[PDB]
Nucleic acid binder design. Structure first.
Length: 187
DNA sequence: GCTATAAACGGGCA
DNA sequence: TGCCCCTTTATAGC
């Protein structure tokens, strides 16, 4: 439990990685769809072949421009590992795929701070950043500015941390908010 | 299922 | 440029 990087003693667990990659060749989406079993394609709803693999369980959206977005992994390494497996698939189906400019694009994390949270008290004294309409959505949307991270804060004490590009942004965001959430420990 | 968040992609409207 | 979609993921109330 590394105290320096996380004085709270709680580390958020990563829940979803969104990465993209440039295969750098033009693809026949219809041919890929016919020859692949794990690939769906309806171009009149969405211009991407949706491919899914089980290990690591991820979903790829592959486009005729040769751009691919990989989604569903729970680590950046698993995102790159999955993105490679997709690129080898299209290679074996007869396309000169490359692996150019792989970039994590969005990381989703979550954790628990163990204590219930008085949401109405935080939505008031942090009205500049908070948006809390419980009849619409039971969590309050907290828009942190440095780092530019959105937090979903719930009464139970569970929080969602989104919008980060690097996991250190997720870790830094959680602990800019933890001493805040401590002031609103519900009785 | 709906409601809420972020991101990339291609694509509709303006 | 803006608006709206598009997939995924945690969270949670109806």
């Amino acid at each position: 439990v590394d105290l320096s990087k996380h004085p709270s003693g709680i580390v958020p667990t990563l829940q979803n990685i969104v990465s993209t990659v440039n295969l750098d060749c033009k693809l026949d989406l219809k041919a890929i769809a016919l020859q692949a079993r794990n690939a769906e394609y309806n171009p009149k709803r969405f211009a991407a072949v949706i491919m899914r693999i089980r290990e690591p369980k991820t979903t790829a959206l592959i486009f005729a421009s040769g751009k691919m977005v990989c989604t569903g992994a729970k680590s950046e390494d698993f995102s790159k590992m999955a993105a490679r497996k997709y690129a080898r698939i299209v290679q074996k189906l007869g396309f000169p795929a490359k692996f150019k400019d792989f970039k994590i694009q969005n990381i989703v994390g979550s954790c628990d701070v163990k204590f219930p949270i008085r949401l109405e008290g935080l939505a008031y004294s942090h009205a500049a950043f908070s948006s809390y309409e419980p009849e619409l959505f039971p969590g309050l949307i907290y828009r942190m500015k440095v780092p530019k991270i959105v937090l979903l804060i719930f009464v139970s004490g569970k929080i969602v941390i989104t919008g980060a590009k690097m996991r250190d942004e997720t870790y830094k965001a959680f602990e800019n908010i933890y001493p805040v959430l401590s002031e609103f420990r519900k009785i």
